[PDB]
């Protein structure tokens, strides 16, 4: 279960042979295996990658013992790829040959406290012949007496975005060891300058 972290630098498009491949750009600047997880004394297996260098100024936290324990320059962020044990060093982009397909998680664009019409592509009402106080309204929510309650999780107006999301089976288009960049297929959640993990895919 390979796995590497990065960010969302931005996206454009390329041309493969003669056809156009709309790509997005991920950044796997060398990642330090910060701590691992042996069932021997953890309960499972997983390697926590750290990311993005950091001046020992905000590192004043007891994390410094933690890095100095793993002989790791003090990063700014770190998470766990599941059951991904490489070797005693650090993971580049060398992990993903061009062509390989990747699963790509990420946190979505926060669309404030959004409306039903937005959240759940609801229908709301007619811009036209009556009511003119429901044109983006939800409609009815329940029934008469029985039941007399509302279904736990009835699609209603709330927050839309800022949630964990994954998008999968993506063709890694190119990989730039020379400067640690990752080409994919374009559609990847989160804004630019956005943190995102990427791992080998679920196909078999």
């Amino acid at each position: 279960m390979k796995g590497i972290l990065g960010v969302k630098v931005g996206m454009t498009r390329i041309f493969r042979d003669d056809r156009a491949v709309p790509v997005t750009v991920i950044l796997a600047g060398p990642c330090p295996v910060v701590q691992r997880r042996t069932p021997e004394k953890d309960g499972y297996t997983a390697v926590q990658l750290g990311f993005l260098p950091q001046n020992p100024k905000r590192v004043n936290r007891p994390l410094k013992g933690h890095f100095a324990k793993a002989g790791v320059e003090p990063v700014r962020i770190l998470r766990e790829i599941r059951d991904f044990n490489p070797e005693g060093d650090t993971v580049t982009v060398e992990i993903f040959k061009p062509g390989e397909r990747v699963d790509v998680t990420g946190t979505s664009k926060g669309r404030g406290f959004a409306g039903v019409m937005k959240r759940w592509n609801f229908a709301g009402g007619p811009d036209s012949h009556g009511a003119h106080k429901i044109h983006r309204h939800p409609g009815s929510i329940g029934n008469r007496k029985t039941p007399g309650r509302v279904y736990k999780g009835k699609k209603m107006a709330g927050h839309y975005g800022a949630e964990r999301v994954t998008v999968m089976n993506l063709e890694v288009v190119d990989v730039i060891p020379e400067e640690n960049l990752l080409l994919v297929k374009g559609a990847v959640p989160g804004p630019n300058g956005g943190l995102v993990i990427v791992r080998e895919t679920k196909k078999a």
Partner: protein, 122 residues
């Protein structure tokens, strides 16, 4: 993008000179159609003693359109009118000499005679 109600032309010496869409053959419930897609449609005008008459419920393939297709090569293409050629159910174009620009797509959809006969597939 042609949808049920849309006024198409007639890229050929078929008889009809203007048809409205009736249903998009595409899916079981596709929203629209485009060049290379077929639709059941109604004839809303025709030259006298034409092979087709008015009111004729026809099957017609789209040759041109007012919403650009996207070429896998990042390019595009869009004409000034929504057009059609009427077709015998084997999907064979009913007119003899077709005329009016058409879309490179048709060449990948089994419709040779339309583009063979056609003047400029663009």
């Amino acid at each position: 993008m042609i949808q049920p109600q849309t006024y198409l032309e007639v890229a050929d010496n078929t008889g009809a000179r203007k048809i409205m869409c009736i249903r998009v053959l595409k899916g079981s419930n596709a929203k629209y159609a485009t060049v290379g897609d077929v639709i059941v449609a109604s004839v809303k005008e025709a030259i006298p003693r034409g092979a087709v008459k008015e009111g004729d419920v026809v099957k017609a393939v789209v040759v041109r359109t007012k919403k650009e297709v996207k070429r896998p090569d990042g390019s595009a293409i869009r004409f000034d009118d929504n057009a059609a050629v009427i077709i015998n159910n084997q999907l064979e174009p009913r007119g003899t000499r077709v005329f009016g620009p058409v879309a490179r797509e048709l060449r990948e959809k089994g419709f040779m005679k339309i583009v063979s006969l056609a003047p400029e597939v663009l």
